Amino acid sequence: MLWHKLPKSIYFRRGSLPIALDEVITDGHKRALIVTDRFLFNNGYADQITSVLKAAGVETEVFFEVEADPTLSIVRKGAELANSFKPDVIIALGGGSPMDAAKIMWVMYEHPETHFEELALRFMDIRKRKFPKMGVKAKMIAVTTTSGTGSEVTPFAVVTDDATGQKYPLADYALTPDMAIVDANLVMDMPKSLCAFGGLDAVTHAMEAYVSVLASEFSDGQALQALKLLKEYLPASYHEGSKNPVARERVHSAATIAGIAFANAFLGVCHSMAHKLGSQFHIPHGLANALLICNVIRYNANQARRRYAEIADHLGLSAPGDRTAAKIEKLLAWLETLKAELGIPKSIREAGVQEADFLANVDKLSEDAFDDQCTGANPRYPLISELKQILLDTYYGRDYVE
Amino acid sequence: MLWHKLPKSIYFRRGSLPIALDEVITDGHKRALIVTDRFLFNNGYADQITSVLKAAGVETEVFFEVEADPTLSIVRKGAELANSFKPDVIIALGGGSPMDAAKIMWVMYEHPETHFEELALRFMDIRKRIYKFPKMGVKAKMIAVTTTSGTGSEVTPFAVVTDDATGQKYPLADYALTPDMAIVDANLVMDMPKSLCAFGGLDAVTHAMEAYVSVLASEFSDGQALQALKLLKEYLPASYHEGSKNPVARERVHSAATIAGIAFANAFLGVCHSMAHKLGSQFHIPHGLANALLICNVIRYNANQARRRYAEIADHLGLSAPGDRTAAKIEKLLAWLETLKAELGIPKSIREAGVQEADFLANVDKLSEDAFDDQCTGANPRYPLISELKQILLDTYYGRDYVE
Ligand SMILES: [Fe+3]
Ligand SMILES: [Fe+3]
Structure with missing residues (x-):
């Protein structure tokens, strides 16, 4: 039930x-x-x-x-x-x-x-x-x-x-x-930075709620609506600020609508790892999610991959005759472009975390992320080894590949 | 607020x-x-x-x-x-x-x-x-x-x-x-x-359709109206045809009707419900059947901003094609609805629903006035004339498409 x-x-x-x-x-x-x-x-x-x-x-x-x-x-x-x-x-x-x-x-x-x-x-x-x-x-x-x-x-x-x-x-x-x-x-x-971090936090909430093992027909439509609003209004909210109050208002509702979804469907390993990055290195919560979300999609897309393709369809990112892989690639390409124009760095390294510091803690981060409450809802049951691989890839700016 | x-x-x-x-x-x-x-x-x-x-x-x-x-x-x-x-x-x-x-x-x-x-x-x-x-x-x-x-x-x-x-x-x-x-x-x-499945399902379709184009539609109701419509498109035919042999379809439609409720509890409805109420009380037509008989002509009416919203529904339901413009998308939305009605055994007119002509003509003026005063009218995206509601009722009685 x-x-x-x-x-x-x-x-x-x-x-x-x-x-x-x-x-x-x-x-x-x-x-x-x-x-x-x-x-x-x-x-x-x-x-x-x-x-x-x-x-x-x-x-x-x-x-x-x-x-x-x-x-x-x-x-x-x-x-x-x-x-x-x-x-x-x-x-x-x-x-x-x-x-x-x-x-x-x-x-x-x-x-x-x-x-x-x-x-x-x-x-x-x-x-x-x-x-x-x-x-x-x-x-x-x-x-x-x-x-x-x-x-x-x-x-x-x-x-x-x-x-x-x-x-x-x-x-x-x-x-x-x-x-x-x-x-x-x-x-x-x-x-601008708080606009970007809060907005990508909201994107992550809706993305994780949609592919969570607890996703339901009552949560799915709010998750997709949150993503559509954020796709359509977050860039203008970030660039234009108070000069575009409608864009600011649409994003404010969207973050709450993402809450409605994840309050009931919960999240996944992007939040599990974001929690540990943020607390260890004092990275804002929304920035940590922004840095991790695309590799978590790549990880979960190996059923979550069908669900990610549905998001691409919903956001108008697919073309006639795309099959699943191409749709997910287009979903990732939209997220990377959104991150870029919101000023998000391309790696945890470029977020200011510096190499010896990261390698000293990466194993504890992986273990703790595994134990985080949000891990149980993730569509893919993780190995600690795999969370470590995602974290390292995100540190150095590589795309996660199996 | x-x-x-x-x-x-x-x-x-x-x-x-x-x-x-x-x-x-x-x-x-x-x-x-x-x-x-x-x-x-x-x-x-x-x-x-x-x-x-x-x-x-x-x-x-x-x-x-x-x-x-x-x-x-x-x-x-x-x-x-x-x-x-x-x-x-x-x-x-x-x-x-x-x-x-x-x-x-x-x-x-x-x-x-x-x-x-x-x-x-x-x-x-x-x-x-105040009170x-x-x-x-x-x-x-x-x-x-x-x-x-x-x-x-x-x-x-x-x-x-x-x-x-x-x-x-x-x-x-x-x-x-x-x-x-x-x-x-x-x-x-x-x-x-089967009939209760059909009437209830098209009631739910109508709730979600009217909630989406209501003047009180919002970003908090819109996604639930669209999700209800998508679930109903994908599972109502199988729920109707297969019944208990397809419990997932019955279960999906049961959730979809509640999800349509979430939308219209907050965004309200429109003149399709206004006119369906009056058909139902006057001629004792089941509520969902009355809505089923009227919804397609209410869309044609409201589509004369409502027409953009109807096109968005067609896009959401996968009914549009590349290079469709608004008019064509609405036509595809209407064609989907008419095909759904047909396979759910909905008649093509109020006449074929069992109301005869003389009784309908004797009450159509009162029906049009009463529907106008119905409280669901205020949320409709098109402010109606009583004249126009009467035309919709007559067209629906005789099985004609409403045309402006
Ligand atoms: Fe969060
Ligand atoms: Fe109703």
């Missing part, structure tokens, strides 16, 4: 934020905790939420100390703030890090009796087994400011234990936000 | 019903009211639910008196049973009639003080309102288990009920009526006769 599980409400288009918040007000919420990071707090993004809520007599508090990774110490501090402030709605504001952090703060607030590493142990991934009851003390709203991680519609969160550096993925549909707000007025200032 | 609003949980594929019901049990529900019709009760469909729930110590009650249309007297009786039995979950089982009836029983149970009167008038459609729908989901959550493929009502905010005493129909629309969970288990549709 399969499922399609999403927030009850996803509000989108420019200007949806104040209208969605009016529903929060009319639903009777009186105490709102905003969870965000320092850049977004400092640059007025939290004010866009708190001004509307305060005008209606809602009490507000802002926790702005989440950084680039959700850490256990920061999550505990935010949960302690919730315990004292007692919100009846938590509003995550930002990219993947604040939204993921807010999900775990929410659990700890709803269930102060539970120890995190308890939860970390039992709810590592989606399977049948129960998650503690959520949404009694507070509802969860996610407001995304990049285009994007899709975390505003997913059951996933990761937090790093400061003391050990160990990452703990959590996954349960009780962590899916109650409402997602996708308002492109919040992304018109994104710099 | 646009939206994408659905049940929190949709469970699907063969065998999904017992797994979905285990979440109902582990969520702590102890009293379940099943709402269905007599055919489904008598043929063991309700047993598939109650056996699982009772084995877990959930108390169950089954209301099986829903008729072919939700009627106000039956809805009131089901609400009174709810008032006495006090369920903490209502489980609708069936096609559109039980699922729509259950939504209204739910309202009356949550809010017995409210006058149905009132609700029917204030909440006829989705719009911006909000009464709070739902306090006494009970709502689960919808669909047994046709299908109306999509398991994911929509819509319900209609007929006043027996007057014959007046009351459409209701609010996202507080959207079920909390939809269950789409094709083990419940393997015995559907």
